């Protein structure tokens, strides 16, 4: 699989917050193309990204990012007056840095991680109304040398939903046996959850893959997550287990009973899924 | 005594689902010997376990595992038609694999860990009723040269009970000062908990033990866990602290007040527990 | 600086005292009780004898996490190691360095971010002690650990921070570049997720990566439950500059209801751009 290059590029993007169907709100890279979750932002460690942000709505909104570097003027908080007025525009700047050695001899960790952005002013001073409506999205920051996936999928547990979807509507995600699939798992809102995958597992470290044979990270298929937690991993689809409709769910019993469920549809090369009704 | 060997043996076992008193249900290795939690299944990485499984109950049941490799047909789900009908039989196969380097140069995570099995059919299409009833049990998969303990105890925080026991009935576990004790700690149901042990601590990694002086893992005595979380560790009973009645409990305050307490009884070599006057 | 090897025997005096409005707290000097309790810092190898006085009219105890204590310093009713009202008792905490056992395994040492609390007030799990403020931090350093310019303790106790009224911080200030140690402890009934704008840390013992081979997750958001304890050291304003950097629980209803504070990081000229209450 491909390998992430060393960062250092200054990139520039427009992003738009727009109302969607049913009182929903989302970000998009171009006007009329807001989505929930918002578009995935992929950065190589050392990149800078300038986000020419526009709020097309009738209420204040913001863009705030976890993990990445930002001056206070890019917080996306009302307390700092770095939110965006109705119809307004503002340029947010996120930077990243590589790991390295400080002067005090100590080690400065790098920006690599599975991170996210969201709104910080819709509803409350903490964006409670924004998460509900869907103002959240993933950011991946890659380290030089990181393995690249064949497909990246974001699953957000926002209160009692997956991706603001109604219960028992997924979403489902498709791969072929052997595909290197990347999952981005963010939790928002009020409730704790446990993310669980049938038939697959990952390491509980930065990349979800053991570094080598001296990596002591626990290997799990089940992880407790809370509001604003984010992690990610990469799995070889159906490795050791074969093709099939592999179920993923929250393992909080009433949460999986009420529809916090989806399917990881792993197809054989020819396209059919063993033991599945399409 | 000693260390885990290399794996790869094909094993077979018989397993039954039976009713127990009080509307409870359990797994056992022989009829009339079901237990809550179910029997401890131990495997070495590479072993294959065929579970000749009989449902001696009048309602459907299934057998589902975390962490191990299994195909779709051994899912143990109503979904891909692998539950066991009342009075029916099924052979579930579980497989494990050693760590290795993939063709693409990535490091494939092995099966070794503290895992668990449970039903996916009683009550709801998830394990809900089965969990409340007691249909759950531990699986340990050891890697070559993992340190082997003198005794293994399973503690399941299932909803607001420890192993479906009444409030304030533990259970209690005995060891002698110096014993190498292994704890398997599983959680199920609806609530998060925080498992805590008095006078002992473990490392937050696969084994619960620091590999050596370069393992950076947290050293902890308190750990948040949610439904279907599982971890385990080994400790030396009494090490640096001496014999006595060492409390373990969930540390959610109302949880310990309403039953979620037990005792780790560490005896002196003469068998007495100092200061423990029941 | 860096922490030295341990070995020393330490003696300290502690009091459980009542506070205004039905609160309780621990103090090192009599009449100086506080919530959170005083910071206790040890080096691996050290022993601490805490001569302890209950200045109150109901029983109290002193229980610790992570450290080594024999049963007689358990601080529980079960082991009859609580302190009578008006009474005194010496609790002994021991620590140890890591080393290799006779059986060749590696014994993990005592170093870490730990805490002490009450275990008898209200119930035999100190539910009433936690409600009133009887908890505090304990830090145990490994030899060679990097020492901060400052340490601040943040206890999520139910839906309060350090038993404070909602929306009352606390705030903590530093100057850009300073080495700031946060101790973070949760108690009560609720899970929380502790988060900091502008800063991140490693999920390991020290909070910092040991080097380029450390695979720990680097995070700015950490779920935690009652009696969870952890710590980290950040460089104030590193890569992001001065400002009023919020920290808050991220469970949405807990941030909205007051579980919010400021990490006030100033420029060397003392200014904090954009900050105004
Ligand atoms: Cu859930
Ligand atoms: Cu499963
Ligand atoms: Cu399942
Ligand atoms: Cu946030
Ligand atoms: Cu509990
Ligand atoms: Cu304790
Ligand atoms: Cu499960
Ligand atoms: Cu306790
Ligand atoms: Cu909270
Ligand atoms: Cu934030
Ligand atoms: Cu925030
Ligand atoms: Cu405690």
Residue numbers in the entry:
A (entry chain B), B (entry chain A): 40 to 317
C (entry chain C): 41 to 317
Quote the paper:
T1 acts as a center for the reception of electrons from the reducing substrate, while the TNC serves as a binding site for the molecular oxygen and its reduction to water. Three-domain (3D) laccases are monomers consisting of three cupredoxin-type domains. two-domain (2D) laccases consist of two domains and exist as homotrimer, with the T2/T3 located at the interface of domain 2 and domain 1 of neighboring molecules, and T1 located near the surface of domain 2.
Replacing Ile170 to alanine and phenylalanine result in a strong decrease in catalytic activity by an order of magnitude. We assumed that Ile170 is rather indirectly involved in the coordination of Cu3α ion within the TNC. In our laccase structures, the Cu3α-Cu3β distance in the TNC varied by more than 1 Å, from 3.96 ± 0.10 ± 0.11 Å in the Ile170Phe to 5.24 ± 0.04 ± 0.08 Å in the wild type (the average value for monomers in an asymmetric unit with standard deviation and estimated maximum coordinate error). Thus, the structure-function relationship was established for the second coordination sphere residue that explains the decreased activity of SgfSL with substitutions of the Ile170.
